[PDB]
């Protein structure tokens, strides 16, 4: 069944964020990706059979972050990168 926008708005009306997160992740699709510290793009080559990581084009092999985003959001980010738009993701607040 389709959990449309109005259903999500009702879940916000009830104030249940954990059921919304579970319904939009574990109940549907949940993806795990790695982003780089300098640039917030998904160029981090992950060869974890020997626990090895890289990010091409910014000289990083140490600071690699792991995030769980839905596969549709990854499709959005990859389509933005295919459309010459940078959806840089940062786990820390630089603006403060």
């Amino acid at each position: 069944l389709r959990f449309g926008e109005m259903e999500r708005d009702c879940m916000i009306a009830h104030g249940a964020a954990s059921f919304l997160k579970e319904r939009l992740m574990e109940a549907s699709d949940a993806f795990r990706v790695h982003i780089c510290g300098i640039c917030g793009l998904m160029t981090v080559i992950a060869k974890l059979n020997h626990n090895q990581f890289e990010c091409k084009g910014c000289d990083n092999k140490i600071d690699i972050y792991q995030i769980h985003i839905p596969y549709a959001a990854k499709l959005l980010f990859q389509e933005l990168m295919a459309m010459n738009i940078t959806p840089r993701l940062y786990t820390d607040r630089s603006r403060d």
Binding site: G15, S18, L20, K21, H68, A73
Partner: peptide
């Protein structure tokens, strides 16, 4: 919602 993690609403 888009990023798929807890939001500052109610319980969260």
């Amino acid at each position: 919602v888009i990023l798929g993690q807890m939001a500052p609403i109610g319980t969260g």
